[PDB]
Structure formats: structure tokens, C-alpha cells
Design a protein around this ligand. Sequence first.
Ligand SMILES: [Mg+2]
Ligand SMILES: [Mg+2]
Ligand SMILES: [Zn+2]
Ligand SMILES: [Zn+2]
Lengths: 643, 661
Amino acid sequence: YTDRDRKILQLCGELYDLDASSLQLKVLQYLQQETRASRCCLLLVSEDNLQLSCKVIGDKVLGEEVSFPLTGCLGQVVEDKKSIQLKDLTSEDVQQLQSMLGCELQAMLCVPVISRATDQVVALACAFNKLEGDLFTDEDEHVIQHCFHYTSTVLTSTLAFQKEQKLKCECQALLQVAKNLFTHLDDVSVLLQEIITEARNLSNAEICSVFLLDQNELVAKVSYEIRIPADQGIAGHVATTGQILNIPDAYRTRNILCFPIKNENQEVIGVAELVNKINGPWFSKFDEDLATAFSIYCGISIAHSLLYKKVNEAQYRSHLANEMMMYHMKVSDDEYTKLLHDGIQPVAAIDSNFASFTYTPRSLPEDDTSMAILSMLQDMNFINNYKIDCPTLARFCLMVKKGYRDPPYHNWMHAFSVSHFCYLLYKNLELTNYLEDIEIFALFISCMCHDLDHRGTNKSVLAALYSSEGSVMERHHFAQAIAILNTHGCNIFDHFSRKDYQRMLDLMRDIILATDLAHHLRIFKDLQKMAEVGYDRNNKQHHRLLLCLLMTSCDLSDQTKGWKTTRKIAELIYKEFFSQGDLEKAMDREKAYIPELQISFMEHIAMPIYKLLQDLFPKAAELYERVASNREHWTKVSHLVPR
Amino acid sequence: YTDRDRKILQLCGELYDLDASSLQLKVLQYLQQETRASRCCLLLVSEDNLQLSCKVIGDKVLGEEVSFPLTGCLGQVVEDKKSIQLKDLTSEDVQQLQSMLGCELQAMLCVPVISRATDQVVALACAFNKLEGDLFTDEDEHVIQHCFHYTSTVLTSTLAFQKEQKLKCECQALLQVAKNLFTHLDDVSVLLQEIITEARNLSNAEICSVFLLDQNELVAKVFDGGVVDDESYEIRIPADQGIAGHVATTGQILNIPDAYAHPLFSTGFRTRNILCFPIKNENQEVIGVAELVNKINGPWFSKFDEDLATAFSIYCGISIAHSLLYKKVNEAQYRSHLANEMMMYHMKVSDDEYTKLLHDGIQPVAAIDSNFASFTYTPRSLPEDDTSMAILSMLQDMNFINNYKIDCPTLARFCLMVKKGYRDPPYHNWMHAFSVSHFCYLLYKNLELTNYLEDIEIFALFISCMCHDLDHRGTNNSFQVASKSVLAALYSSEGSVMERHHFAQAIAILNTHGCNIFDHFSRKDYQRMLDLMRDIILATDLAHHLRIFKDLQKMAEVGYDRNNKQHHRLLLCLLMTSCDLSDQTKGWKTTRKIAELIYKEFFSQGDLEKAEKAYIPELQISFMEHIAMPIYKLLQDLFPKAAELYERVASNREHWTKVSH
Ligand SMILES: [Mg+2]
Ligand SMILES: [Mg+2]
Ligand SMILES: [Zn+2]
Ligand SMILES: [Zn+2]
């Protein structure tokens, strides 16, 4: 009648609430009337069309939303969109109803809410206990229909907008939490805590504990440490099965929501359980997809967080050891900043003759040396050509210097004068034409390190000092230079592609082990044919013997100096060569040999080298003749020797 | 009024659409009627109540929602909730509506939709060009009102719902990216692409470029996957240059409508707009910059593509920061092993080798041999393939595997690596090492070392016995004659140079993968367990032995404090020395067979190659007399069960005396 169309229009006038719940009251309360039903309520059919939900019964807006599987007798309504009555009952729907309900069920009118839009039962409108003459009519059903035909659109939309308002909210939630667990990849311990806090507020649990699978067992240290079998109890099952587990009653216990962690694959890597719901009977079957959502970020973060500990742990042990090879070398910040005072200086300002074969590196001050190295590499365009952080480079140089010990001869001062030669060779013989830049770098870096941590060596041959060992010692020096590169902010080969970096290691390993006179002798016959048959810049092999050769030549480079200079150094070579050890455990008439020993060295070792050098580099002849000369001075000092 | 209250109920009967737009149509096409207005449309007041929007004009649902600032003439309606008419509009306003709807404007009825809940003008109901007889009445405005009073709620809620559904998947959008990025914190190269792919979809740019601040300059590596064998092109622009430079320098976003119109902006491209934004870390230090070029389907960058950029830019900052932080480590690590690999001549214990050794049966010592533990045992007697086991069985029986929870797959790998780790001289071979370790082992039993030293020491001792001569070669050299030489120059000292080498070698193993049997020691143990090995192995220097010898006496003279930390050092040195020359305690034909190896080594090779056996008695006699004996006399001067050893050296000393004759 136009009369129902009075009360209805009156209704919709009133349904102006923003809350789908408060709208439901008005609609219910109006039916509670027009059907003489004691109590009325709507069971909203789930999005997945597989569950019923009821948040408002009668004139009471339930504290917690009641829900339950979309059964059969109550689940057939949804299907044929036909209205049923109590006499059409399972004892379940009758149990789960009068339970959710709260009383005697004598009557019941189920009229399906079918949308004119989607066109499907969206809600199950229920009327119970007909006030009095328990008689729900074929018209009691009509009034219901009629009501929703107008009222349903809005009801549903205010309800839906409220679902997206929630959905939108559990993301900003997660967006937040994602950004909080990721700010602690530093500390699996802090992170592990975050996961707990966050996991507790997200679901609103009384308590969360988190277990990290440790092989065949769960360890929720969460402060003490708690081991236990990986397959035992709740945690063990969930961990074993890799699938969530929800508990209504567990039997201040009650409920437990427990979920897996799993990694990139689906390998459960940990497990977490929440106990007891706050403001609730259990865990919203929504508190599961939300927990699963979260649980992705827990697995992502734990996985990397642990994988980062493993490194830091290891890498630490790696240096605990490496500082052992260091005699703990002290290169203080003040030390390096002091040397590195924005002025690397230029070689030109070092000295006029600083670059001519007639220079005597030992002639400089010892505190003015590490500079020269910076200005020597600088001018060889190596700092910029390779983008060498200076704070690092100046730290290397100071460390390599503090790495030399103190014998007469085998001291840092020998390493500098050996490197300075290398430097000379570079300029004077223009090495850029014969070898790649990375070689001239390694050759020089080697000169700087070849005798590191040396302590001095000692019917004998000089090429047993200034020379060989079993390569044992050459391997040491190389090994020591490595410890330096392995020291923080000292690795000057920081940015080299792994490609360069490796070869930068091999190069240095070869060159330094090349400083073994016993090795030189071995390749010597190879160093000749190359001298005989040019020197292929394309020949990878020829590069090797050149680099050996140059090294050797820098190493005994003191043979090419002035007589009075070689005279002075020979003192140091021989002061060393003749002393100490384990002999300690219990010379003038044996310094008489210093001449023959010396003469023999030059003739047999030293000259055959400078001969070669000038047999490849004619610019290198001045060195040979210098060696051949000094040889003759030595020859005279030998005349004074008896026979 | 029952008649409108007929038409209205009839309207809501119809307003069952799910699309807020299809609902606006029915409401609008009802009003196009009831007011005899040529066309109708609603202008929805923005959430921020600063903008009017219209997606439906007449019976046409617009392909692109129209919008515009909530003006003054149209904005006073929102304020006093008073409905107005064209004659209340400024020509300015007027020209906009005409232009917005595309027709003449003679009439117009604007009725404010006030919320029955919020109670605020939510929309502006517009009636245009009165269908002939241009006259919009005081009741034409009433039918409008009335209509909404019922129709407005549902209208407003369907609208709302649609905005939340749009907001929710714009959040989920962020979640996917956030997760896509946070799962690439290994190589900052892959993640760095993601940041691009992702950020480019996020704002919908034609192109994205990411730059990382490398000190005082912006850097950007080339890719898509060319191949970084030997890296792959790196762009550097001064950190304060152009757009990125500014944004990097000022650390604040930068939006451009037209880029040519910029002080800071040609080979085909021709760029329109640019959105550039900073990266910054936990503090607010710009760590990187990213620019998006050209908007797809748009003039520029929504002032919403900015907050979105900022939002994302957070995750970028998070991941980039950690990603790089991890590379730094991993580098420092590859750069170690690469070196470490080399001080090893690339040793490789195979996944098969180890499992073959480790066949669930460590076997006990007891089943090795009857008195495999008695002072008369000749370790050298056993088979070479059967040694590594013995080790495993000896550490087993001393209770070290479990007491320290040594992973066996790690431990067995270690043992096979320190073995493959020895070389091949006559005397300084793995066999010397096993026999030397074995002697340690014996000592532990027979003297019951558990009463004098801490279990960690007996552990370092043994482990040193295992490596003390790693990677050894043959010592000998030149001989000041061969009669003018001392055995305490082989079976002894060096300059400590070599002992430092064996200690260091053993470190390269521990530093090799799955061999660090000291994996789980507290940083405290791990350290001390390294000093221990360092000291002990350096103690295998005869020159060092002699050096502390006088201190090895007062201890032997004055008891042996187990509380003396100093007594434990000497005691451990002594023990090592004793295991080193332990073959002096073996049986005459045993020691005789050994000395051959010692003496075969002690006499050969070197640089002599590049560049007298009759003394084997005095040489050896002199050894025992000066070095070897005073040791075993001290071993028995502290351990009386160690007497059997002394006498066995003193005796062997005597046979040697006879071979001398
Ligand atoms: Mg040398
Ligand atoms: Mg040794
Ligand atoms: Zn040298
Ligand atoms: Zn030994």
C-alpha cells in the first residue's frame, strides 16, 4: 500500500548515519515492529560468499562481530534465494543460531537480501520469535523484502566503505611496520624484538614469542635462550607443516594464533605465536591474512638480518687474525692528516736532480720520504688515473713504512731508494711504452713492500742475502703487504673491478717473489733470448720477464751509484750479512773477503743484469758502465789483498 | 507532499547502483525533469573543502573528471550554505561553467547539498538553462533540497567507498614496491634497477634515473644487464650541478611543469617535465637523487606524485643504505679470500673427500691399535690414508668434539686441509706432523695433562702440533761446511720467519670456508685460541726454546704453579718442543730410520742449484747432548711418568756413541 511507502520513505529519511552499524539498528528496529518479531538481525554473506557475519542483534550492537561458515540449510538460501523457516532446520544452524542468538527458537523468518545490482543474496535477514501468536506470514516476508528493495543499496554501501576504510588502514599499518623492521637489519636481536612488539599490536595479542629454526629445533631465546625440538608442540607442528594454525580455546591462557616464517623459497625459517586476544573471543579469521601479510616482512627481514650477522661475525674473526700479522701498526689519524696537509707537493720541488740516474735517494731526510712517495706516484699519474683516496693512500704509505724493521741494510730506507729507482726507470726509460699502466703501478707498489718486516739476513755468497731464501721470505713480505691492504682504509685498490684487483695481487705476488735471486738466476736464460729477439709488447710472456728484470734492477740499484755512495751502502749490506741468530746460543780477518765477495757478486750477478737492461733500454747504458766502473774500484781494493 | 514522496521513493528504488557515477545519473536525470532544466550536474566539494569536482554532466558520465579551485563566488555557497543564481555570479565564474558544459548560460540554480550527518555543504547541485520560460523558482530549489534529503546519504556513501578502494590499492601498491625493493639488499645493482622500474611505474614517468652521491659528485652505473665482469660505465656529475646537483645539495624535492622554462634544463628526445627527489639516510643526509622525465597521460606531475615520490623515496633510502652497507662487508671479504685463496696455492677439500672420511664412524682410538697410546708407539708405523681418521679419533678421545661442539663436517674438512697443506720434503712432511700431534695426544694420556693446563690450552697445543710445519719446504742450506753446521738449525730455528709462516698458513685455513672449527668460541675464546696457536707455533723455534730454557729450570726447580699464568706458557712451550723432537724417545731402529729423513733433508738443494755423512754421528750426538736431552730431563723433572722418555734418549744417545767409534 501507499501506506508502507510512507513508513519506508520515513525510514530512509532516517538512515543518514555514517556507521553501517547504526544504520542497521534503525532498519532492524523498524522490522522488529512491522513483523511483530521479538528480535531481528542480518547475517551478512561474506565477500568470498563462504561465511555469515552478524554484528547487530535486536537493538544491541555486538561488542565483537559474530561469524560462522556459510552452512547448508542456511547455505541453500543463498543459493536458491528462497526464504525459509525454523522447521527448515539443521540442528547446527539451530545451535549456532540460538547460541549466537541467546534463546528459545519457536519461530524464524529467513528472507534473503538479493541485490538488484550484483543480483545475489548479500544478506540473510532474520526474524525470530513472533511476538505472541507465533505466526510468520507470507506477507511478513513481503514487508521485509519491500524494506530492503529501498533500504539495501545504502545499507550495503555504508558497510562496504567501512571495509575499505579498514583494509586501507591495515596497510598504512604494515607500511609503517615494514619501515620499522627494516631500520633494524643491524640487530637480529632488536629486530627480533620489533617483530614481537609490532606483531602484538597488529593482531592485538596479550603476548608474542618468536622461534627461529636452528636446524632441527626451535630457538625462541625471547632475556634468555630457549631451545626445543623443531617438531614439538604448537610451534613444532606449524614449523613442520609450514602452515598457520588458529585456536579458539587452547584446551591466563585461552587462544593461540601461531604462524610460520619461511624464506625466499617457502622454507619455514622461524615461527611466531600470539596468545590470547584483547577485547575478543579469539583471532579474527582476518587476523590471519593480516598475520600472513606481516609474516612476509618478518621472513624477508629475518633472512637478511641473519645473513648479515654471519658476515660481520666472520669478517671480524678475519681481522682478529690479520691484526696478528700486524705488529698492530699504529697509523693514527693525526699521523696521516699531518703528512696529508692538502699539499702532496710536486717532485719538481723535491730537488733538481731528483729524477736523474745520478740521484741518491738515501740522500734525503727520512721524514721527508713518505712525501716523496706521494709525489712520485702523483707525477706518475697514478692517484687520479686510478682515483686513489689520499687519506687511504697516505695511510698505506705510513703503514708500509712502519712495517719495515731495522737492520743495517734491509730497512725502509732501502725500500724507498728501491722504489725511487723504479720511479727513475719509469721517467728515464719511459716505461709507459713497454708495459701497461697497471704494471708500472704494481712494480712500484712492490718496490715499496718487497722487504717488509725484514729483520736482516746472514766460503759464502752475497746473493744469499741481497737475494734468495727458499722463497720463504719473499712470500712473507708479499704476505705482509697483504695484511696491510687488508687493514681498514689502507686498501688503495678499493675500486678496481674484481678483475683488476686480482691481477693487482698476482702482479705483486710475482714481482716480490721475483726479488728472490734464486728465482732471477732461473729465468736468466729466458731473459736473454728476449734481449736477443727484441721484446714483444704484445708478448704476455715478455711482460713477465721484463717486470722481473726491472724489479731485480731496482733492488740492486745501488750498484749504479757513485763510488763513494756504493761504498757507503756496501757497509750496511756487509754489516748485516755478517752476524747474529741462534748462534747467539753460545771478522776483520773475514771482512778481508768483502772485496772478492763483492767483486764476485757484481761479475756474476749484478753486471749480467745491467748488461741486459741496456740490451733492451739503451737509455740504460749509463747504469751498466757505472756498474762496470765500480767493479774496477772494487778491483783495486782487492789488490791490497794477500795471496 | 505525498506526490513527490512518491517520485522520490521511486527514485531510491532505482538508486541501487554500485558505481557512484551511475547513481548520479539517475539523480540527475530525475532533476533534469522535475525542474524543467535543460541540463543538470553536481559539483562535489573536495575533502579538503578547497576544490569542486564534476564527473557527470546531464546524462553524460565524463571520460575525465573535471575540477577547479573552490573559488569565491562559487565558494560562498559552501560557506553560508545559501543557494545562488547566474545573476549572483561573476562573468569570470559564468564563463567557466559555459566553458565547462559547453553551451549558453541564461539561467542556473545552484543548491548546496548539506550533509544530514556532517552537516556541511558536500556538493553543489546545479541546474542550468530552464527548459523554456527561463525562470528557476523558490520551489524549484525546494524539489532539489527534498531530493537530496533522502537521496544524498547513499549517494555520498557509494562515493566514499570508491575513494577508499582507490586509496587502499594505492597503499597495496606501495607494499608491493616496498617488498620488491627490500628483497634485493645484496647487489645494489639489482635493487638499484628495481628502484627505477618501480619508481617509473609509480609516478608513471617516460624515464627514471637514479644517482648515488659518491662524496662530492653524483654517480650512476650503466646496465640492464650488459655484464659487470670488469664493471660497466659510470657517470659522474658534480654533486651540486644541474637539477640533481641542486636537489642533492638542498635535499628537497623539485617539480617541473616545463623543463625549458627552467634556469637548469636535444638529440631526438625533447623533454617536457621533470620530477626530481632526494634520498637521504636515517638522519637526513641525501644519499642519492632520482629524476623522472615526462608524465605519461598528463601535463606534469600531480602534486600527489611528490608525496608518493617522497613516500617511496623513504624505502629507497632504507634499502640503498643497508644494501651499500652490506656490499662494503662482502667486498672486504671477497678481497680477503681472493688473497687468502692465494696463500694457499688454491687448496680444495672436496664435498666427496670429506664425506668419504666422515662416514658416520669416527671410530675410537681403542680399535686403532692395542697400545696406540703407550709411550712405545710409533705413529709413523700407521698407513697414510688412516692418519686423518686417527686425528679425528684422538681429538675424540681427549673429549674435544663434543666439549666444544665441533661440527664434524667442518672439523674433518680442517684436518684434510691441514694435511693437503703439508708439502713433500724428506723430513718436514704431514707424517712428521701426525707423529708430532700423536705425541701430544700421548702426553695428554700418560701424563694426564688435564691436571696442569686448561682444556683450551691442550686444545691449542694439539692444533699447533697439527700445523707447526705447514707448507714447509726442505731446510738445509749451503752448510758452513756440513761438519761446520748444527742440527738445531733445521729441527729448530729460522729468524722465526718460517714459524710465523706455519702459524699464518694455519690461519688461512681457519679463514677458509667451513673449516673454522673455532666457529662458536666467544670472541674471548677465539682470541685467546689464536694467541695460543701463535705463541705455541712460534715456540717451535729452537732459538726461542734456548731463549726461555733458563726459565724452564726455575719452574722445574720450584714446582709448577697451576695458578701461575707464566708457568702455563713455559709448560706449553716445553710440551710443543717435546712433541717436535719426540722421535728421540722412540726405539733405536725407529729413531735410526727417522734420522735418515732428517739427514737426507738437512743436506741439499736451494739456490746452490742456480748459483761428510760421517759427521751424522757427532752432529747427532752433539744434538741430543746439547738440545734434545736437557728437554726430556725437564719433562721428567716436572712429570715423573715422563722418565721413560728421558732414559730412551739417554740410551739412543749411547748407540749413536757406538756408531761414532
Ligand atoms: Mg730481498
Ligand atoms: Mg718447525
Ligand atoms: Zn731488497
Ligand atoms: Zn716439527
